[PDB]
Amino acid sequence: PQITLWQRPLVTIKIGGQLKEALLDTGADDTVLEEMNLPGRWKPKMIGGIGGFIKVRQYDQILIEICGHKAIGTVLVGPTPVNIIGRNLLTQIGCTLNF
Amino acid sequence: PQITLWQRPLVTIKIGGQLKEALLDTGADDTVLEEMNLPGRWKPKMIGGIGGFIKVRQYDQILIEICGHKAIGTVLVGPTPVNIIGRNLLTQIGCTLNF
Numbered sequence: 093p094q095i096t097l098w099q100r101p102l103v104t105i106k107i108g109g110q111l112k113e114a115l116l117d118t119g120a121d122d123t124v125l126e127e128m129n130l131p132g133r134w135k136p137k138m139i140g141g142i143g144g145f146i147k148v149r150q151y152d153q154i155l156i157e158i159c160g161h162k163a164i165g166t167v168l169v170g171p172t173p174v175n176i177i178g179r180n181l182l183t184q185i186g187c188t189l190n191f
Numbered sequence: 192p193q194i195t196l197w198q199r200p201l202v203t204i205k206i207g208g209q210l211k212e213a214l215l216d217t218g219a220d221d222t223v224l225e226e227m228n229l230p231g232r233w234k235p236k237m238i239g240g241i242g243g244f245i246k247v248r249q250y251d252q253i254l255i256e257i258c259g260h261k262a263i264g265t266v267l268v269g270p271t272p273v274n275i276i277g278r279n280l281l282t283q284i285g286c287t288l289n290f
């Protein structure tokens with residue numbers, strides 16, 4: 093699809109059997125989701141943006157679907173204000189910026 | 192152009208006659224630049240990211256070029272970690288996401 097930017101680019105993702113709304117975010121290196129359970133081991137991580145840093149849990153090799161496109165990647169979980177799909181996963185679904 | 196997301200989508204902008212690097216950021220509603228001097232009146236704004244809210248100065252009707260594309264719009268100035276080109280300007284230059 094071609095998604096315009098008149099409004100926030102929110103899409104439906106599928107992860108851990110749950111469906112969620114997340115923001116396609118080219119300014120995000122990583123994918124960060126609100127608190128949720130995921131399987132496997134994890135390690136702590138600090139991520140920063142406008143406003144400073146928050147502490148998240150890093151889960152590796154997690155299957156995710158973004159608008160029907162399947163991918164695998166690292167997913168961070170913590171107190172993010174909104175669900176963010178970052179560059180680590182945008183690449184996998186073939187997402188580019190065009191103008 | 193077409194910009195892939197394997198690295199940050201950093202571009203050259205020009206504002207106040209000077210060249211700066213900035214991030215094409217679909218996850219940002221607004222454009223926020225690092226501390227600098229701009230002409231005219233400003234108004235206050237609070238904007239929120241990953242780690243909380245920061246105070247910034249809003250300037251309207253500012254000339255800014257993004258990859259040589261001329262734009263005139265609102266530019267926020269404050270303690271942001273990096274120069275960010277947000278949707279307000281990405282729309283002016285005709286930027287979409289595609290996959």
Ligand SMILES: CC(C)(C)OC(=O)N[C@@H](Cc1ccccc1)C(=O)C[C@@H](Cc1ccccc1)C(=O)N[C@@H](CCC(N)=O)C(=O)N[C@@H](Cc1ccccc1)C(N)=O
Nearest residue numbers: 119120121122140141173218219220221238239240241272
């Ligand atoms: C991986 C990680 C998630 C940490 O990356 C980022 O945070 N990247 C930065 C851009 C950035 C990149 C690199 C360094 C610093 C910042 C952005 O792309 C994140 C995005 C996504 C996000 C959205 C809401 C809450 C948290 C995050 C972000 O911060 N957007 C902000 C950008 C600033 C702005 N005013 O445009 C945004 O749209 N804010 C809006 C909306 C808002 C209001 C209140 C509370 C929250 C949001 C605003 N006007 O504040």
